[PDB]
């Protein structure tokens, strides 16, 4: 070989040293969202019982017999709120991923003639404790977890039945 | 878990007058409660008048005070106001202020049952 080959080798080494990386932030955000999913999954044992024994969905945390919203905290979750049978979990604000900072996800159920279906996805809201339909959050504050930061099994739409 | 409520603003006014009642609550999480106003006339029993939700976007009234009473909440001063207009001689009673615990600051449930704390009461007579 000669000097040209060595220079080309050095250039190739420099090229390989600085290379683009895939979007690994989305996977980390997906991993961190699972904590809020698990924390919200633990409050459905006290909502279904109230609905079954009273005929209407719980209005607040007091009616469902769960702890205070600000007291349901984890490593990346700061609050879990129950409102008209809808469970909303909010992320933290300081030591989290830059993409799921102060964002919310929902967990609601719809009653069928022989089962009670459960849905997971973006935030939704109800209107009355005796209603059977849900609508979008429309918070106008950009507090919705993006689709890319959710599992493929947790992307239900507000009109799903 | 020792919230206390103080009621002030009562007085004596002629019929057709206006009065402003204020309830001040201090201690721990005072923004997690729903303030409900009661009224007890001599001879009769206690009854509900107005209620306000924790979120502040749900206010209910009584059939006998519809269109004449207004209730507002200001969390900055930790006070809840109840304004009366077009007073009637049949409104002579003692007003009380009490709170109900709701584990959320974004609730919309108002109820007149199962109250926790209470207040001393304020005197309001019209003649
Ligand atoms: C629990 O939440 C219920 C929604 C509420 N019920 C109502 O508001 C009425 O059914 C009118 O919709 C209950 O009063 C709440 N229970 C307690 C103990 O606060
Ligand atoms: O009042 P709640 O428990 O729903 O929480 C309010 C907010 O999330 C502050 O943490």
Author numbering:
A (entry chain A): 1 to 161
B (entry chain B): 2 to 128
Anything the authors wrote about it?
Typically, the type IV pili are helical polymers constituted of one protein component, the major pilin. Type IV pili not only serve as multifunctional organelles allowing the adherence to host cells and the auto-aggregation of these bacteria, but also play an essential role in their pathogeneses. Molecular dynamics of the whole pilus with GATDH and G3P for a period of 1µs showed the overall stability of the structure. As previously described, the PilE monomer contains a 4 strand beta-sheet region, and an N-terminal melted alpha helix that forms the core of the type-IV pilus. Immune evasion against antibodies targeting type IV pili is thus attributed to the structural diversity present among strains, including variations in pilin sequence, sugar type, and phosphoform.
The C24 nanobody has an overlapping but clearly distinct binding area, mostly on the alpha-beta loop and away from the hypervariable loop. In addition, unlike F10, C24 binding to PilE occurs with its CDR1 and CDR3 loops. The CDR3 loop residues [R103-V110] compose most of the contact surface and hydrogen bonds, with a minor contribution at the basal section of R30 and Y33 on the CDR2 loop. Shape complementarity is also pronounced with a buried surface area of 510.1 Å2. Interestingly, the C24-GATDH binding cleft is much more open compared to F10. C24 R103 forms a hydrogen bond with the acetamido arm of the GATDH. The phosphoglycerol modification is located in a cleft at the border of the interaction region, glycerol part of the PTM is sticking out. The phosphate head forms H-bonds with Oγ of S105 and the backbone nitrogen from the main chain of R106. The glycerol part of the modification does not seem to tightly interact with the nanobody. Even the phosphoforms can have a strong effect on binding as in the case of the C24 nanobody which depends on the G3P for efficient binding.
